Amino acid sequence: RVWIITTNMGVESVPTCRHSKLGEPSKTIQEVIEALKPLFEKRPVWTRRALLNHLDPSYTHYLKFALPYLSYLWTSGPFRDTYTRFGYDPRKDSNAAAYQALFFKLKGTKTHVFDGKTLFPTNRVYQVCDIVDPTIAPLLKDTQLRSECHRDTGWYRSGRYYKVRDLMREKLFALIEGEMPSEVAVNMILNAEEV
């Protein structure tokens, strides 16, 4: 057991400290905890994949034991599959729109970045701040955030959120097959009115 505390969007208050069952970690895990601390200062919400890509690769399978000392895990909602530092509630801070996670249920590079062009991505959960694709990123940079964090779409208006999701999904369909997305094909999704 790693003693990770999990949350969903209905939780009254987010976790503020580690699971009571956790004791003091080995020096081996403490090293990973020390590496994680500044990463959580830089960015309060992270997927496992994004963290691994910022960590010494020898920490790969110690990471799951270290995270519960600093963070809790969303198991659904707009922050699904992200670890959030204790005491930070992304439902209360619209700046957390940048850290929302989009999961894709689809069938290579280990990157956490969504560029729209790198073939055979293995990642299936992308955070907004890691979307560099210049045709998709402006859609979420420019949009007026909602006045409340929605249970599914978080800080993003539904029609804009699902346009972005559809664009990403279409590009992934192709990238995972070893094909470049068709600009003209994708442009139909991009130019569609928002539902």
Author numbering: 190 to 296, 303 to 390
Text lifted from the article:
Type 2 promoters contain two gene-internal DNA-binding elements named A- and B-box that are recognized by the general transcription factor IIIC (TFIIIC). TFIIIC is a six-subunit protein complex of ∼0.5 MDa mass consisting of two subcomplexes of similar size, τA and τB, which contact A-box and B-box promoter elements, respectively. We therefore structurally characterized the S. pombe TFIIIC Sfc1/Sfc7 subcomplex and present crystal structures of two structural modules. The N-terminal moiety of Sfc1 (Sfc1-NT) and subunit Sfc7 heterodimerize through a triple β-barrel fold most similar to the dimerization domains of general transcription factor TFIIF Rap30/Rap74, whereas the C-terminal DNA-binding domain of Sfc1 (Sfc1-DBD) comprises a winged-helix domain most similar to the winged-helix domain present in TFIIF Rap30 that is packed against a second domain with novel fold.
The crystal structure of the C-terminal domain of Sfc1 (Sfc1-DBD, residues 186–396) was solved at 1.45 Å resolution by MAD using selenomethionine-substituted protein. The Sfc1-DBD structure forms a compact domain that can be further divided into two subdomains. The first domain (residues 186–283) adopts a winged-helix domain fold with canonical α1 -β1-α2-α3-β2-β3 topology. The third helix α3 is not continuous, but split into two short helices α3a and α3b. The second domain (residues 284–396) consists of five α-helices and two β-strands and adopts a novel fold with no significant similarity to any known structure. Subsequently, we will refer to this domain as winged-helix-interacting (WHI) domain. Structural comparison using program DALI identifies the winged-helix domain of Rap30 (29) as the structure with the closest similarity to the winged-helix domain of Sfc1 (Z-score = 6.1, rmsd61CA = 2.7 Å) among the many winged-helix domains present in the PDB database. Inspection of the Sfc1-DBD electrostatic surface potential identifies an extended basic region on one side of the Sfc1-DBD that could interact with DNA, whereas the opposite side appears rather uncharged. The basic interaction surface of Sfc1-DBD shows two separate positively charged patches. One continuous larger patch runs diagonally across the surface of Sfc1-DBD and predominantly comprises basic residues of helices α2 and α3 of the winged-helix domain.
